[PDB]
Design an enzyme around this catalytic site. Structure first.
Site, PDB file in Angstrom:
ATOM      1  N   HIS A   1       0.832  -1.201   0.000  1.00 60.72           N
ATOM      2  CA  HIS A   1       0.000   0.000   0.000  1.00 60.72           C
ATOM      3  C   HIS A   1       0.869   1.254   0.000  1.00 60.72           C
ATOM      4  O   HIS A   1       0.899   2.047   0.946  1.00 60.72           O
ATOM      5  CB  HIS A   1      -0.949  -0.027   1.185  1.00 60.72           C
ATOM      6  CG  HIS A   1      -2.071  -0.991   1.004  1.00 60.72           C
ATOM      7  ND1 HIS A   1      -2.151  -2.182   1.690  1.00 60.72           N
ATOM      8  CD2 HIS A   1      -3.135  -0.962   0.164  1.00 60.72           C
ATOM      9  CE1 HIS A   1      -3.233  -2.834   1.299  1.00 60.72           C
ATOM     10  NE2 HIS A   1      -3.840  -2.122   0.369  1.00 60.72           N
TER      11      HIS A   1
ATOM     12  N   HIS B   1       1.366   1.325  -5.827  1.00 65.72           N
ATOM     13  CA  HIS B   1      -0.020   0.866  -5.872  1.00 65.72           C
ATOM     14  C   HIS B   1      -0.962   2.000  -6.248  1.00 65.72           C
ATOM     15  O   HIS B   1      -1.858   1.823  -7.081  1.00 65.72           O
ATOM     16  CB  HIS B   1      -0.415   0.248  -4.531  1.00 65.72           C
ATOM     17  CG  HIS B   1      -1.881  -0.025  -4.399  1.00 65.72           C
ATOM     18  ND1 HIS B   1      -2.547  -0.942  -5.181  1.00 65.72           N
ATOM     19  CD2 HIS B   1      -2.810   0.508  -3.572  1.00 65.72           C
ATOM     20  CE1 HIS B   1      -3.828  -0.957  -4.845  1.00 65.72           C
ATOM     21  NE2 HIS B   1      -4.014  -0.093  -3.860  1.00 65.72           N
TER      22      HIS B   1
ATOM     23  N   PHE C   1      -9.057 -16.295  -3.804  1.00 67.36           N
ATOM     24  CA  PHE C   1      -9.409 -14.883  -3.942  1.00 67.36           C
ATOM     25  C   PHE C   1      -9.975 -14.587  -5.326  1.00 67.36           C
ATOM     26  O   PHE C   1     -10.907 -13.782  -5.461  1.00 67.36           O
ATOM     27  CB  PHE C   1      -8.190 -14.006  -3.648  1.00 67.36           C
ATOM     28  CG  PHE C   1      -8.499 -12.534  -3.493  1.00 67.36           C
ATOM     29  CD1 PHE C   1      -9.383 -12.092  -2.522  1.00 67.36           C
ATOM     30  CD2 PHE C   1      -7.875 -11.590  -4.298  1.00 67.36           C
ATOM     31  CE1 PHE C   1      -9.656 -10.731  -2.358  1.00 67.36           C
ATOM     32  CE2 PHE C   1      -8.140 -10.225  -4.133  1.00 67.36           C
ATOM     33  CZ  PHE C   1      -9.033  -9.802  -3.167  1.00 67.36           C
TER      34      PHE C   1
ATOM     35  N   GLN D   1      -4.477 -17.267  -3.827  1.00 67.82           N
ATOM     36  CA  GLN D   1      -4.757 -16.567  -5.079  1.00 67.82           C
ATOM     37  C   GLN D   1      -5.958 -17.177  -5.784  1.00 67.82           C
ATOM     38  O   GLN D   1      -6.866 -16.461  -6.219  1.00 67.82           O
ATOM     39  CB  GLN D   1      -3.549 -16.623  -6.017  1.00 67.82           C
ATOM     40  CG  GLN D   1      -2.340 -15.809  -5.597  1.00 67.82           C
ATOM     41  CD  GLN D   1      -2.697 -14.600  -4.773  1.00 67.82           C
ATOM     42  OE1 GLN D   1      -2.476 -14.580  -3.564  1.00 67.82           O
ATOM     43  NE2 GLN D   1      -3.237 -13.574  -5.419  1.00 67.82           N
TER      44      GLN D   1
END
Ligand SMILES: COc1ccc(CNc2nc(N(CCO)CCO)nc3c2ncn3C(C)C)cc1
Ligand SMILES: COc1ccc(CNc2nc(N(CCO)CCO)nc3c2ncn3C(C)C)cc1
Ligand SMILES: [Mg+2]
Ligand SMILES: [Mg+2]
Ligand SMILES: [Zn+2]
Ligand SMILES: [Zn+2]
Lengths: 323, 323
Positions: free
Chosen positions: B73, B77, B285, B282
């Site tokens: 973050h 990003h 998600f 992954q």
């Protein structure tokens, strides 16, 4: 003086408590003395193992964080909303309905619900690009601030009145208090009332005759509307109290309008001392906001609130008769 | 170095921009250079009379408030989300839908949407009784903070990029930006997706296939979902980019889990470096969050998102094959 104060505090279970007299007799500590009295009446210190010195220390600090120079949104208003919520919680239609933790949440939320109020509206704070509106992204600006201050003060020296609650109790209480105070934002009133009307139309009563509230949504909705009714209870009080509250909020509004006028802003409705009609404003506020709310609350707890509604209607007629 | 940087920026209108290379070539200023390029590409400086030095001053100040020691973050990003939103805004099915002010709001929202992120989740902030969660009453804690910082930085010297917007334009843009950034809170994902599906099922289109969105409520919902898709666009990018993003967010998550473990806290899901399967995570998600979102988006803009969806599907197949 303490003898007269103790006498007046015997009326803590009554609609129409002499709250302005209590403010004077207590040395401008109405919130402290009324909260302490209510906590003793409901056995909350014993139930939640609150040390008395911690309670008094927190209450005095909380009361200090109300602005003594604001005409309406001060510690007297907070004490009045606390005491009004305390009476509403005792209504026969709600007997044994709410847990001790929910009762604690509603009373604590009432005590903190306007703390550190600056005496101007959310819209004024938004339109003037205030630091508060910048912090809170224009959304329930004051109400988010009242919560943050009320909870932050628990972390001051000997102020954590919830020190002996379990972790789950503290988490539940925090969530309930936030849900209640955020519902005091007037921008939420219409949707709050619409939901209360739906609950009345679909209401269920137990074999005991009390309200059946079997999920968090319904339980928190009742507590939100209860505290919102207490916040909007001035026009339901005996006329000598109602007129004093009106004089105070009118002074607060007119002071905001004077700031708007100086800034070249359009004066907010009812804030222009050169054009307002306080009497017409009372009738309109009752007709469009206060009576629709209180008539619905009275339906929910029928007939427990009939005398309160009757007083509201008498006060509306009195203000109308002055026009 | 400056010539190779200009060459990579020629792909600013393409899905799969070499954003990590831009970050290196720009001296860790991908947000500043990509935002500047997009503003020039869309003629936003002349449309809104933004002085170029004011824009650069603000962008560098904003970029400085992304943390360089947070693995995911950070300013890279932010630059990636800005550029992804810029591409989605040019979807042929959305031609003529959004005003210039709505385009400005979506791009500005993307730039500020994670500013001052501490590298831990809202739930961590709530469970550690952080100052942020106390300020914001446990509700969209980070997202409220990102907005407050992003707007507050406009008040620094020569940083008000909106100085030449009319007062009504500034109020409208501010409201839209708030609505968009608050929609990036993952706790709102399900409701956001359900509303996007409703819009798909009731969508009106022209003869060519261009969406017609008459009311503001629908248009803000599309912008909310658009920036949310851009925030969740890593698995739809070329695999080399996606794997780099996965390595960074895994590091950030594991660092949070290390802090939780040190504090004796319950370790958050996917944050336990000793009990993690990044590849299985992954696929999960993608299956439960990213593919449902992007497939609904692809339906709304049918068939303009097909190449993006194709990449997401290829990446899911590849990660599954590593299991
Ligand atoms: C000139 O002087 C007066 C004095 C009182 C009133 C009537 N009372 C109240 N009017 C209003 N508003 C104006 C009426 O719509 C703001 C919108 O609700 N908010 C109130 C009132 N009492 C409490 N609150 C909130 C702070 C909860 C009118 C004009
Ligand atoms: C071990 O390492 C990894 C790495 C990536 C993932 C998958 N990606 C992301 N997972 C999650 N969450 C974990 C559960 O899926 C929380 C929300 O459900 N939030 C994300 C992700 N990418 C972006 N965000 C938000 C910050 C917007 C998993 C585990
Ligand atoms: Mg209030
Ligand atoms: Mg975020
Ligand atoms: Zn109040
Ligand atoms: Zn993000």
């Amino acid at each position: 003086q303490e003898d007269v104060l103790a006498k007046e505090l015997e009326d803590v279970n009554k609609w129409g408590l002499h709250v302005f007299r209590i403010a004077e007799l207590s040395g401008n500590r109405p919130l402290t003395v009324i909260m302490h009295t209510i906590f003793q009446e409901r056995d909350l210190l014993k139930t939640f193992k609150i040390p008395v010195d911690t309670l008094i220390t927190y209450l005095m600090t909380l009361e200090d964080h109300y602005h003594a120079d604001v005409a309406y949104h001060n510690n007297i208003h907070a004490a009045d909303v606390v005491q009004s919520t305390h009476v509403l919680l005792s209504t026969p239609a709600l007997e044994a309905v709410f847990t001790d933790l929910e009762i604690l949440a509603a009373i604590f939320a009432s005590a903190i619900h306007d703390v550190d109020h600056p005496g101007v509206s959310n819209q004024f704070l938004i339109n003037t690009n205030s630091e508060l509106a910048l912090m809170y992204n224009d959304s329930s600006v004051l109400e988010n601030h009242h919560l943050a201050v009320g909870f932050k003060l628990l972390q001051e020296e000997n102020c954590d009145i919830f020190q002996n609650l379990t972790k789950k109790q503290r988490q539940s209480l925090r969530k309930m208090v936030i849900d209640i105070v955020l519902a005091t934002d007037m921008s939420k009133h219409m949707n709050l009332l619409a939901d209360l009307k739906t609950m009345v139309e679909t209401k269920k009563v137990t074999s005991s005759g009390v309200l059946l509230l079997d999920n968090y949504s319904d339980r928190i909705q009742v507590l939100q509307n209860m505290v919102h009714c207490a916040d909007l209870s001035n026009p339901t009080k005996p006329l000598q109290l109602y007129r004093q509250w009106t004089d105070r909020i009118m002074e607060e509004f007119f002071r905001q309008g004077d700031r708007e006028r100086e800034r070249g802003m359009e004066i907010s409705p009812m804030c222009d001392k050169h054009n307002a009609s306080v009497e017409k404003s009372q009738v309109g506020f009752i007709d469009y906001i206060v009576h629709p709310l209180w008539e619905t609350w009275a339906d929910l707890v029928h007939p427990d609130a009939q005398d309160i509604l009757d007083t509201l209607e008498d006060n509306r007629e009195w203000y109308q008769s002055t026009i």
